[PDB]
């Protein structure tokens, strides 16, 4: 009985060969695992960053596949202290970080051959994903400037700098991150926004719904008086689809490149 | 006049079938022992208990021909003032700010300016006009609140209610506060009712006396009439003898 | 006859000056270092096509005037609140209005949302809890000073559990966007929000400025104020409403801002006096000054990110708390 | 002749009873599929229930005993603080030790780390700020009661802003970790941890219980306490150390836990008396009983979710502060 | 023998008690007279060694009780030689009358009952608060509270098998009957133990009535000392109190203005 913590790892585990094989059965996950439908059916033991071990053990695991974000350390230690093997994975925002989850989960689940099939499909579609983007820079000009909005604090946006999933996804789609000079997430100033002068606003489906839709995003202070705001240029995508860094990476990048290119027609 | 008739208040009934009246020009002293209604009597004459207090009052107290109950809080302030036993400022007001508050109930200004300063002289606090109240001895503070309450009753028949005003004052100022008050009472047509800790001070300074025993008034009249060993023994539970001077003074037998 | 504080207009004019001054300097910065030539065709008419309108009139000017409105609001409410409790520490958030707005705002963010409904979640939240705290403490009709603080903190516990419960079930977009609002920020300033607020605060200051003399009679004693014929219960009510309004309006869009209601009215009181006729104006002038002065370092000290000005007005209070420590320790 | 210090053993005994009884119910719940027959078989039987032999000794046993230590410690330190300030409101966090622990802990979530070197950050961070607060407030040497709150909440500003900086610059995993860890939780309880915690709180206890007769002569006045030849200034020191040691140890691994310091010693202050010989025991027992009850209600009310128990001990003082008001309204 | 000799004390800016010398004998009752804040509260504070006992105020001269300076006496041991009644406040907690009086046995310790508990009961009775043993002090009147605090200090000096009692205005806010009963006790306590009393009082008449010794303190120095007959004169009172006074006789003398 395997429990997986982290949406992309759940995608990887199911991508090796479904909910249950001769070698394993997935029995639980965290709330961020919304794709595919086999993951969503799984009982959930809370958000990936906050956990109760007795509840985790209530899903009766023999092994836990845990992302780098799985926590808190107190909860993980209680689970490890219960005798369940817990294997933690790294996040490096690049093909290498993804390949280690594919092959590592296959190793942990003892399905090496299935992992070899998944990695080969992924990497070939991945080379195609590099190629489709390289065929044409979105906009037909130099890499455009993209602001990724994670969420809003009232009327103030939280934006991704470097060392973010969004920074990597933006670069992979043939564009350039409008935010420079800081790491991780931080509230956006109108000053940051005007200096960043983004050509496109990228946002998640959840973030777009949370802010109130497309028009609500563009009326945010400072958004109107920017190239993206003057052109009302918004792209929304499912958060798990866009940022998860899992086996859907070539398709996620290809989709992002398309939506950027359509927005800059 | 300020007159209560068969005044009942009450949690027991503390003060029952009280009938008494203070009239302009006359200084009544309220004698009796602690927690026997004196403080409550003054609170009733003040109106603290009849505009919108949970305690029930019966009978009525009439302030110059009209019941208390039918007098606003502002209107009253112009007809009546009270000197609560003591209090400390809690903010560094100067003495002229505090005294000036006495003219608060008179509101549409240099005459309010004027009346402040003349009342500080009269109460013997003029030298303090600029000072900060949180730096004052208990006596300087008392002279200032006396100036402030005096500034409130002027006008150019009012009722001054004294709740043990001389307490914690040195000896010279006790008598000079009570002398001032009788001069104030005489010169204006102003009515004083004063709670006092020392009966001998009530004999010395009150033209009328009320002794509060039981919950009811047990003696009333001039000092010479009320200050007797019998009245004091019943009101105070305490053996008093009587001695003369060149007014009477009381000594325990 | 003298004698008085004659300093008082001098510390009010010089405070009026500096608030204007600081405000101009607040238009003259900062990030996206900017040239105003176009602004004149943008405000009205000038040679150059629309360009600095974009920022200076839509982005910058709303935040400065929001910083003035919030700083005069928390300063002025701080003045009448502490005049009420006779206690210099009474922050205007004792009505439960800072709690109430916080819950209102976090109940919207977690229970789908949209925009321009968040202010009114915070605002309706801020008023409803104030009335709850009142309805407990009062007894129809007189209320009592230590009770209002007791019912105040009991419900503070209630509303605060509802928050700690809400943050727990709240996903990650919820959490980071939560804390930042509870630290307070004018980063999302806009014109028809301070047109939405200003009729509240500017109404609130005027109900307050009119009860200023009854508020002076309190500070020598709630009972002698009664013998002066001030209707203390009504007074408490009028004050407690006016502040729950102005503070309820101002927290709705600014978030949790602290140490202005403690620092602003007290630095004017050691300056001159406790005279409420002159503490209300000055505490607004100073309070406005200081928030606009600390926001202009929320924007600018680390660019391009807004430190929440809560982190900054907290930086203000600590020394001026550590100051009056040193002014008080003789014997 | 005379009198009424009896009734208390009956309320201390029944408190000791109810504390143990509750520990068994706390032992005897987990994720809902576990009966007493196989639990007794696990602890005292064959290796068939050996997986339950892990939990009942490694997961549950340290979680329960932590709740009796956090509960007994916060209640007992609360009794002492409130005897010291002669004010039944003072929580053990007036020294600034709760803030400094919150800071030390959050200054390590953004450092370098891991792992067992975190409850040393919060414990050393909490101790440091408490020695700071004392060193400002102390005169070398007298001290003074209101100057300690002055300097305590002067630094409370400092810390809380260093936090507000950290939570701003902190990425998502760091920001989630903070918020819940400031709400407090015993979901980290394991044996080696509370084997390190216990000899502090049990030590802090024993310095206290030994001061108890000197604290009685404080409650009738600092000047008459001086006349009875209690060295007021030394005792103040010793209380402050022992409560900085216990409360520092305890917040370091349970997070910020409140309202046990305010509710526990005051429910036993109404039951019997304010007599420090009888309040410090009784407050550690009720304090424990309650938090254990409060926790187990967080283990299980929303299983498999583990509610922060700061949500629940807050749901515990809210009715029993509003009770308090119900009985003190007039006046 | 509590003896201050050339006692000088000052808090900036300027002295308050200058070049004083008083001594207080066991068995006699000294009543401190004089204007308010001429230093009597501060005189008393020195005799307890308050301003000496801290392990910022200037004191010179010497104050010695029973042969040893107030400086070198450890405070807990001074609690066994001297007790102080400062007109108190209501407490902060609902201590019962017994608990409070029991705290009077604090400087006598090693729990400490029962002999220390028996003593407490007799102090209340002697101080006239016996019918209050169970009551909660915060429910009491100012007069009932006062007699409990008088019981607590008595319960602190009870010999059974020479000590100094320092009363800071002990009868204020008592009824007439209660003032005199308290001072009569105090004199009886002073006589049957070989105990020494220093008492501030606000009625100069009560000082002639109950004090075997009187010290008049004007200007910050002691300007008259001795028996009531020697001290209670119009001349002494006029300089000490700034007030016209004439003496009156009875079958002790009293004081009348004008």
Residue numbers in the entry:
A (entry chain T): 41 to 305
B (entry chain D): 1 to 10, 13 to 55, 59 to 113, 119 to 166, 174 to 263, 267 to 273
C (entry chain B), D (entry chain A): 22 to 133, 141 to 359
E (entry chain C): 1 to 55, 59 to 113, 117 to 167, 174 to 263, 267 to 273
Paper text:
Most pathogenic Gram-negative bacteria transport haem across the plasma membrane using an ATP-dependent active transport system, the ATP-binding cassette (ABC) transporter system. Here we describe the structures of the type II haem importer system (BhuUV-T) from the Gram-negative pathogen Burkholderia cenocepacia. We successfully characterized the structures of the ABC haem importer, the Bhu system from Burkholderia cenocepacia, and showed that both BhuUV-T and BhuUV adopt an inward-facing conformation in which the periplasmic gate of the haem-translocating channel is closed and the cytoplasmic gate is open.
The crystal structures of BhuUV-T and BhuUV were determined in the nucleotide-free form at 3.2 and 2.8 Å resolution, respectively. The structure of the BhuUV-T complex revealed that BhuT interacts with the periplasmic surface of BhuU. In this interaction, the α3–α4 helices of the N-terminal domain and the α9–α10 helices and a portion of the β-strands of the C-terminal domain of BhuT are bound into a shallow pocket on the periplasmic surface of the BhuU dimer. We prepared haem-loaded BhuT and mixed it with the bacterial ABC haem importer BhuUV to crystallize the haem importer complex BhuUV-T. However, the obtained crystals did not contain haem as judged by the colour of the crystal and the electron density. On the basis of the crystal structure of BhuUV-T determined in this study, the periplasmic gate is tightly sealed by the R204-D200 salt bridges and hydrophobic interaction (L203–L203′) in H5a.
